[PDB]
Amino acid sequence: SRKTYTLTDYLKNTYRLKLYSLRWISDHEYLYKQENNILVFNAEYGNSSVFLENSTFDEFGHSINDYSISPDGQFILLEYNYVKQWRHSYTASYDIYDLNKRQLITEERIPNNTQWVTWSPVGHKLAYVWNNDIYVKIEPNLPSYRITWTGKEDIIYNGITDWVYEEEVFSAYSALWWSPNGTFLAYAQFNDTEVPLIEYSFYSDESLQYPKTVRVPYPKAGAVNPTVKFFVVNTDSLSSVTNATSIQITAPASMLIGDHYLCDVTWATQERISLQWLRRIQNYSVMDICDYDESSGRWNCLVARQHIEMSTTGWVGRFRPSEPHFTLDGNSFYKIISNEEGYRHICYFQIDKKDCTFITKGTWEVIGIEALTSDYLYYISNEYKGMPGGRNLYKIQLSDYTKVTCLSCELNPERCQYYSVSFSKEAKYYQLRCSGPGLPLYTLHSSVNDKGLRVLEDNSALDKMLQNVQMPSKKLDFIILNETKFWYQMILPPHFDKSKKYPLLLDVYAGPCSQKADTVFRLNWATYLASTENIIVASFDGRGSGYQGDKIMHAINRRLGTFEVEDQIEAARQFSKMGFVDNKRIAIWGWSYGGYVTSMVLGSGSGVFKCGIAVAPVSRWEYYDSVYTERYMGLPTPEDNLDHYRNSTVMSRAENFKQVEYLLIHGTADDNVHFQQSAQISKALVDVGVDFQAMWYTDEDHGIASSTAHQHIYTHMSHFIKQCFS
Amino acid sequence: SRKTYTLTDYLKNTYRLKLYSLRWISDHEYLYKQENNILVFNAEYGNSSVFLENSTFDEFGHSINDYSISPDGQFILLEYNYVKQWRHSYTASYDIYDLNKRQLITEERIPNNTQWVTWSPVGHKLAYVWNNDIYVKIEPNLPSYRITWTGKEDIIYNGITDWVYEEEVFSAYSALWWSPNGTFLAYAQFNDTEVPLIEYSFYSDESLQYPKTVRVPYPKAGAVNPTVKFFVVNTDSLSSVTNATSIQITAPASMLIGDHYLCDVTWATQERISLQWLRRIQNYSVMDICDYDESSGRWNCLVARQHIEMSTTGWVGRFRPSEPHFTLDGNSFYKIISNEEGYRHICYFQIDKKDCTFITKGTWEVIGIEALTSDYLYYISNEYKGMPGGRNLYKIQLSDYTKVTCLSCELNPERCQYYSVSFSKEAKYYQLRCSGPGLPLYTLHSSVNDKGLRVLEDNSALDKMLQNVQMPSKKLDFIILNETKFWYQMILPPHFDKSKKYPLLLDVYAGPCSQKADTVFRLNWATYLASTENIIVASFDGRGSGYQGDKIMHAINRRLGTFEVEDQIEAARQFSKMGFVDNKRIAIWGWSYGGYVTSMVLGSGSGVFKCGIAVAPVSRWEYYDSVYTERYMGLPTPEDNLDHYRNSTVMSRAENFKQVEYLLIHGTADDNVHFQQSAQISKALVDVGVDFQAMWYTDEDHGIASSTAHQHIYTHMSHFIKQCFSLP
Numbered sequence A: 001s002r003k004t005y006t007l008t009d010y011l012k013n014t015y016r017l018k019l020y021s022l023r024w025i026s027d028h029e030y031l032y033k034q035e036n037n038i039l040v041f042n043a044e045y046g047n048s049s050v051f052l053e054n055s056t057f058d059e060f061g062h063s064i065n066d067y068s069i070s071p072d073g074q075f076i077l078l079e080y081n082y083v084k085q086w087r088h089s090y091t092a093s094y095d096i097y098d099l100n101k102r103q104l105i106t107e108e109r110i111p112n113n114t115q116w117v118t119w120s121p122v123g124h125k126l127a128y129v130w131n132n133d134i135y136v137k138i139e140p141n142l143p144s145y146r147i148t149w150t151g152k153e154d155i156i157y158n159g160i161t162d163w164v165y166e167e168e169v170f171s172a173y174s175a176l177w178w179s180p181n182g183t184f185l186a187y188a189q190f191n192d193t194e195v196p197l198i199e200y201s202f203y204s205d206e207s208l209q210y211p212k213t214v215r216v217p218y219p220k221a222g223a224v225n226p227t228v229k230f231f232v233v234n235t236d237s238l239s240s241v242t243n244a245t246s247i248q249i250t251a252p253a254s255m256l257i258g259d260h261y262l263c264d265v266t267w268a269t270q271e272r273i274s275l276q277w278l279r280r281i282q283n284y285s286v287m288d289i290c291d292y293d294e295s296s297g298r299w300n301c302l303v304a305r306q307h308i309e310m311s312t313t314g315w316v317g318r319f320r321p322s323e324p325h326f327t328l329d330g331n332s333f334y335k336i337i338s339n340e341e342g343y344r345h346i347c348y349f350q351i352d353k354k355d356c357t358f359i360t361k362g363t364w365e366v367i368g369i370e371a372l373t374s375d376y377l378y379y380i381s382n383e384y385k386g387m388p389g390g391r392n393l394y395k396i397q398l399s400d401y402t403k404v405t406c407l408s409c410e411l412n413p414e415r416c417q418y419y420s421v422s423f424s425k426e427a428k429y430y431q432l433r434c435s436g437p438g439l440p441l442y443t444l445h446s447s448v449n450d451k452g453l454r455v456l457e458d459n460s461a462l463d464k465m466l467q468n469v470q471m472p473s474k475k476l477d478f479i480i481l482n483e484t485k486f487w488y489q490m491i492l493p494p495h496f497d498k499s500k501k502y503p504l505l506l507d508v509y510a511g512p513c514s515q516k517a518d519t520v521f522r523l524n525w526a527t528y529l530a531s532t533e534n535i536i537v538a539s540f541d542g543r544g545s546g547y548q549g550d551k552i553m554h555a556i557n558r559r560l561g562t563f564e565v566e567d568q569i570e571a572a573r574q575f576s577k578m579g580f581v582d583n584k585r586i587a588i589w590g591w592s593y594g595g596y597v598t599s600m601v602l603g604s605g606s607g608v609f610k611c612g613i614a615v616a617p618v619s620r621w622e623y624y625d626s627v628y629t630e631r632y633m634g635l636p637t638p639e640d641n642l643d644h645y646r647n648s649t650v651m652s653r654a655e656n657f658k659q660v661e662y663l664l665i666h667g668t669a670d671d672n673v674h675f676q677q678s679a680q681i682s683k684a685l686v687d688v689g690v691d692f693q694a695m696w697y698t699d700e701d702h703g704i705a706s707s708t709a710h711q712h713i714y715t716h717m718s719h720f721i722k723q724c725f726s
Numbered sequence B: 001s002r003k004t005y006t007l008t009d010y011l012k013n014t015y016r017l018k019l020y021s022l023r024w025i026s027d028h029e030y031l032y033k034q035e036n037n038i039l040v041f042n043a044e045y046g047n048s049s050v051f052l053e054n055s056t057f058d059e060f061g062h063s064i065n066d067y068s069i070s071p072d073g074q075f076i077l078l079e080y081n082y083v084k085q086w087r088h089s090y091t092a093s094y095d096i097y098d099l100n101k102r103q104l105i106t107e108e109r110i111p112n113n114t115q116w117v118t119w120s121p122v123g124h125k126l127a128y129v130w131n132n133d134i135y136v137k138i139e140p141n142l143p144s145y146r147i148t149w150t151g152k153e154d155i156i157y158n159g160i161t162d163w164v165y166e167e168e169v170f171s172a173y174s175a176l177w178w179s180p181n182g183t184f185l186a187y188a189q190f191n192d193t194e195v196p197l198i199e200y201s202f203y204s205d206e207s208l209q210y211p212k213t214v215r216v217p218y219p220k221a222g223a224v225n226p227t228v229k230f231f232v233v234n235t236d237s238l239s240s241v242t243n244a245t246s247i248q249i250t251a252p253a254s255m256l257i258g259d260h261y262l263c264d265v266t267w268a269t270q271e272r273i274s275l276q277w278l279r280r281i282q283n284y285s286v287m288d289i290c291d292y293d294e295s296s297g298r299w300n301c302l303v304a305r306q307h308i309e310m311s312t313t314g315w316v317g318r319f320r321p322s323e324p325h326f327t328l329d330g331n332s333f334y335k336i337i338s339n340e341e342g343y344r345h346i347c348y349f350q351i352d353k354k355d356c357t358f359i360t361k362g363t364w365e366v367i368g369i370e371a372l373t374s375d376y377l378y379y380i381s382n383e384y385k386g387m388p389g390g391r392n393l394y395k396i397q398l399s400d401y402t403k404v405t406c407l408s409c410e411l412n413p414e415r416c417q418y419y420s421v422s423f424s425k426e427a428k429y430y431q432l433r434c435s436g437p438g439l440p441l442y443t444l445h446s447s448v449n450d451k452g453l454r455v456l457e458d459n460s461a462l463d464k465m466l467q468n469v470q471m472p473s474k475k476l477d478f479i480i481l482n483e484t485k486f487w488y489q490m491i492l493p494p495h496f497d498k499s500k501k502y503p504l505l506l507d508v509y510a511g512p513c514s515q516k517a518d519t520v521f522r523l524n525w526a527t528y529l530a531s532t533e534n535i536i537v538a539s540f541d542g543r544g545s546g547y548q549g550d551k552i553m554h555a556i557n558r559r560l561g562t563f564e565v566e567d568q569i570e571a572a573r574q575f576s577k578m579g580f581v582d583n584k585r586i587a588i589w590g591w592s593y594g595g596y597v598t599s600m601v602l603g604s605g606s607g608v609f610k611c612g613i614a615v616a617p618v619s620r621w622e623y624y625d626s627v628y629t630e631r632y633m634g635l636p637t638p639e640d641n642l643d644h645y646r647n648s649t650v651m652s653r654a655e656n657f658k659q660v661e662y663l664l665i666h667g668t669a670d671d672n673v674h675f676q677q678s679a680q681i682s683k684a685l686v687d688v689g690v691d692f693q694a695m696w697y698t699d700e701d702h703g704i705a706s707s708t709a710h711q712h713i714y715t716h717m718s719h720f721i722k723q724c725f726s727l728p
C-alpha cells in the first residue's frame, strides 16, 4: 500500500518545495527570477512584464550564476566565474550591461577575482573590493577610483571581513556600507598581522603531485585577535585630483582600553551613522552615533548620544548586540534588548536620552524588527499561543502601545504558524512567507488595510505528489524539568501506533541560543528515517536554547558542555519511558555543535544511548575561534575560565565510549572546525582502547556539501543507524 | 578442550619467543646483554664473567636505552633521551664512561641532539654528527675536531643520510665509514636544496592549540633528487692546527653525465676503498676502487680497476648493487651478481681484471656472502631441497669450487630450514640462528671442524607453554602457472579437516623481490586468525617475487600493478577450488605495497574476493619516492613510462569497488606513504558513489606502531574480518 519517502528521494530531490523569491525595487514593484527570464511585477494588481529576456545573454560565453540590477534599473551586474571561499565569501568575475543601450560595457571593466561588489542604494554607483583594496565607480564605464592602498592578502582587509569577522560577527564577506543616498561609503579595515594561522593539507585533484598547505589567519580561543578601524569616504569628492581622503571614526575610549570588536553599523540618515562596539569580554557594548560636520569635514560622535548595553547574566545580544532601527529624522530608534525580566523586547530610544521605554513586554520574545513607518512598527515574535517555536508578524501602533495587531496569526492557523516577511521600500506592501507546519504558502499584502491581495505560491504541485506517499507526522510539545517547560519535537512514522515500540534517534544541535523544536515543515534525512525506517526522530531544546528568555539561554554562560548536554540526556531518559519508545534502541546524532554535544552525551556514561554519530564535532574549546568561544566561555587563562575549558573536552571522556557504538566523521579541509578536533578525539579513543567507526571526507569542509560527499555521508550514516537498530 | 591463541594473546604478548643476541668483540669472545647486566662469554668453553654490573648506573638519573662498548673495552657509550625520527634515524644524548677508572667522563661531552655516533673499528676514536656536521674525538675526554662546516638542517647533510637515502639505499641514518684500522673516516654529503618538501599536519598532544606542519625534503617520482659528494679525511692529521682537509673522491665520468646515486661503500684495505654508483635510470652501475696516494695526499681510482654491472632485463641488484667482499690483500673480491641464466650467484673478481668467474651455479640463489677467510667463503642460499623459501649456511673451498659443504642443512632438518648466521671477528666461531619451521633454536659452532659447541637457546620455555594451546599448522607448497612453479603457504587452523570448508584470508605484500612463502615460524595476527577464528591465512609469491631468479623477479619491470596483482588473483582462484576453501568467504589484506596490491585486486572486478583491508597503501606511483618507484617504473614522462604510471592507479578502478566491502586505514603522520595516497582513494570512491569503511590514525606513521595504535588497528581489523566472514 503506497510508497514511503526514501533515502534516494532525499538525496535525489524527487519532492521539491517551491519558493517565491522576489526582490522589491520600489514601493510598488518587485522582480521575479523565472530561470530563463527576469520579470517585474506590479504589487497592486499582479500584472507583470518581461524585464530581461532569457536569450539576452546567449553569446556571452560564460555561465552566469547571479545578477544584480542597479537601483536605477539602468544597468545590470553579471556574476560569473564564481569560486567559493568560506561560508559567505567568494571571488567572481563581473560584466556590466547597459540597459539604456542594450550594450555590454567593455571599458574600465571590473577586475577578475573581485572579492565583493555592490551598487549604492540609489542611482548606479559601484564599490568593489579587489586585492583587498576598495574601489569606487561613479559610472559603469568610467575609470574607477582607488580608495585604499593598504590591502595585502591575509594581512590587511579593506572593505571585506577576515575569517572570524565573516563567520562570527557580520555573517557576510562585505565590510562596506553605503549611506542611504549613496554620498558616503563607510568601511571597516581589519589588521590580522599577528593573528596565528591555522594550516592543513588540501589534496586537490589526483593530478596534484604534492598536497598543498592552506593557511588562514584564524584566532583560536585566547589567541591574538585581528584589530579593526572604521572609515567614511565621500564619493562625491573623488573627482580625479588625488587619493581620496578617508575619515576615520575611532574609539570609544571605553573600548580602546583593551581588545574589542566592531559589531554593527547602521546608517541613520544621510549624515548620521551609528556603530556598535563590543569588548573582547562580550558582556559590555557601546553604541556611538556620529554626525557629519560639514565645516570640519570629519565625523563627530557626541558622548551625549552614546548608549551602553551590557549584561550581568551573560553576553550581550542573542549572538551580538541587536541592530537599531531609526525613525525618519534619525533622532530616535527602536532596538531589541533584554528585559529586566530577561526577555528580549523592543525598546524606544531618543538618541540623546539614556533611558529607553519598552513598548512590548511578556514572557515571549520579539525575534526581530521587520519594518518601521511613522505610524507603525512591524515585528516578528513567538508570542502567539505562548509557543516559542512559532513565528508571527505583528504591528504595534507607535502613538499607543496598547494597539498591537497580529497580522499572520489567523490567516490559516492550521497550516501556518511560522512566518517571515519581506516589505516593499516604504512598507506599502509585504510578502508573508509561511514555512510550516503545513506546506509553504507565500502571500502578498498591502499595508494600508493589511488585506491579502493574492496567493503567490501555495505549493499545490508538491501537495499532489505527497498524498501518494506515506509521509511522517510532527508533534511539537513539552515536558517539564524543575518547574520550567522545555519544548521538543518528534517526526513520527506514518500510522504511528502508540501501542507499538519504536527506535528513537535524538537529532541534536543545542548550541547557545538555538532552537530545534519548531513548527517548520521539512523534507530531510529525518523524513526518510521516519517514513521508510519507522524511526522516531526527536529534538529537544534544553538549557542554553534561545527565544525563551535569558534564564534559559544564559544558563550555560561560562559552562559550555554542561547543562545543554545533561538536558539532552534527561529528555531521552523521559522519552524512553513514554511507552512507544524502545529503551534498548535509542541513538543520538549531531553536526558541528551538535557533534560536540552528541560526543559529550555518548561519553557521559549515562547508558541511555546504544550508539551515536558526531559530524565535524568541536572536541575542546581552545581549538575553536575566539569570537564565538569566548562569548560563552571567557578567556582560557587560569585567572578566568581555563579550568572549565579543560573540564569540558570530549577527550577526557574517552573511557566511557567503551559502552557505546560511535561514528566520527569530519571533512579534512574544514576551515571552521579543524579536522584537528576529531583527530584528537580518535587519538584519545585509541589510547584507552575503545573501538569506533570513522570516516574522513577528503577536501570537504564544515558543510560536507559537495554533491557526491553529501550523498555519501548520508548513505554511510543510514547504514550505521539501521545496523545499530535492526 | 584446551584454549586457542587469541587476539589478546597477540596484542598482550603472552607467548614470547626467546632470543640470543650476542655481539662479538674479538675472535674468541662475545657480549650478552642480560637485562640487568652485560656479560662477556668465552666461545671455546662457554664460561662467562660480569663485564658491567646492572647497578653500575643507578644514580645516572637517566634511563639508558642502549650502549656501545668501544672496540678497546676501555670505554662504554651511553645512549639516552632517544627520540625517534624515520625508520632508522633518531637523535639522542650521550655520556661516555671510562672503564679504566670507573668514572663518568664529564668534559668535552658529546652534544645533546646528536644525530649519529660510532666508535672507529679499532681502539677508541669517535665520530659523531651534530647539527648536520661531522665531529671527531681522538680521546673520549678531549676536545672534538669539527670536520665539516656546511651542515644546515634539511639542506646539507654531512655524515648522515637525507630521507630517501635512509629509506631506500643505505637502510641507515649513518653516512660515514671508518677505514679498518681507524686512520681514515670516509663520508657522504647530501645536498637537498632543490628537493621538494612533503608537508602534512602533526597534531601532537591535546594541549597544542595550533597543529604543526611537518616538512621533509622528499623527492617523489620524477622530481628533483638530492645530489651527493664523497669525502675521505685522515683522522691522524687533525692535531689542532686548522680545519681538517677532506679529500673528495668524485665521478665516475659515466655517472657525472646525469643524475646518479652513491649506492655502496666498502673499505678493502687500510688504503683502498671501493664505491658503487648508480645512474638515476637504475639498470647501470659502476664500481670504483680508489687507493690512497701517500705522496699526493689524494685518492685515485684507476680506471683499470673500474667494474661495470648492468642489467638488460631490469634494474641492478635485488634492491641496489650487492656489496663486494675483498680478500686479505684487497686485490680480489667476491660479489653476488646475476647469472647469464638470471640467477644471483657469487663471482670472483681480480680488482684489475674485467671478467669474473662464477663459483656457484644452479637454479637457486645465494642470499648473501656471510664470511670470507683465506680458505673458505661462507654463504647463505636457498639451494637445499630446491625450496626458495629455505635458508642454509654453506661453505665453499676457495681452492676447489667443487668442495661445497652445507653446514646447517642436516643439523635438525625437521625443525630447522631457515638459518641466518653471525661469525666472530676472524670467523673462528659462528652462531647459527634457526627461525623455522619449528621454534627458534640458537647454536654456537667453531669453524675449524664445524662442530657444534652447544645450544645457546632452544626456547624450551615457550615450547612448554605452546603445548597447552591449540596452535595452527603451516603448509609450504606450490602450484603451477604457465609451466613455472610458484610457492605459497597457508596457516591452517588446528585439527584441520580437508573435509570441512574454511573461509580464507589472503595475506599479501608482493612487492619487487619479496617473499611471503617461507619456512619461518611466526606468532602474529594470522596465528590468531587461524587458531581462534578458524580462518585459513594464505600467502602467495607470484611474478615479481624474489630469490627465484630474474625471469620471475623482472617480470614486472616497468609494469608495477600488473602481474603481481593478477597472480594474487589467480592463486586465490586456485585455492577456492581446493575443496577445503569456502568460495563465498575469501578475503584479502595487505599493508604498504601489500595495501596497494590489495586495493588493485579489490578493484580488478575479478569478483573472487568478498572483502579486503588495505593499510597505508600506495595509490599512484607518482606519489611515492623517486629512488624506489623509478627503480621499477622508470621516469613518469611521456618519452619514458608515464602511460603506465597513469594506468596503474587505484583511483582509476574506483567503480569496481561497488562489488566489495573495503576497509582503508592510514596514519596521518605517515612520512613514507603520505596520507595523501589514501586521501585520493577515498575521494575517488566518494565520486563514483561506493560505500566503504575507513579509519585514520592520528599522528601515527607508516608502521602504526605505538602500543595503543597497534592494538587498536588489529582489534578493528579483527572485527571487520569476522563480520565479513559471518562468524564472530
Ligand SMILES: N[C@@H](CC(=O)N1CCCCCN1C(=O)c1ccccc1)Cc1cc(F)c(F)cc1F
Pocket (backbone or CB within 6 Å): A167, A168, A169, A171, A319, A511, A592, A593, A617, A618, A628, A672, A673, A702
Ligand atoms: N560560530 C557559529 C556562528 C553561528 O552560530 N551562526 C552565525 C552567526 C549568527 C548566529 C547563527 N549561526 C548561523 O549562521 C548558523 C551557523 C551554524 C549552524 C546553524 C546556523 C558557527 C558554528 C558554531 C559552532 F559551535 C560550531 F562548532 C560550528 C559552527 F559553524
Ligand SMILES: N[C@@H](CC(=O)N1CCCCCN1C(=O)c1ccccc1)Cc1cc(F)c(F)cc1F
Pocket (backbone or CB within 6 Å): B167, B168, B169, B171, B319, B511, B592, B593, B617, B618, B628, B672, B673, B702
Ligand atoms: N622503499 C621500500 C624500501 C625497502 O623495500 N626496504 C629498504 C631498503 C632495502 C630493501 C628491503 N626493504 C627493507 O628495508 C624492508 C622494508 C619494508 C618491508 C620489508 C623489508 C619501502 C616501502 C616500499 C613501498 F612500496 C611502500 F609503500 C612502503 C615501504 F615502506
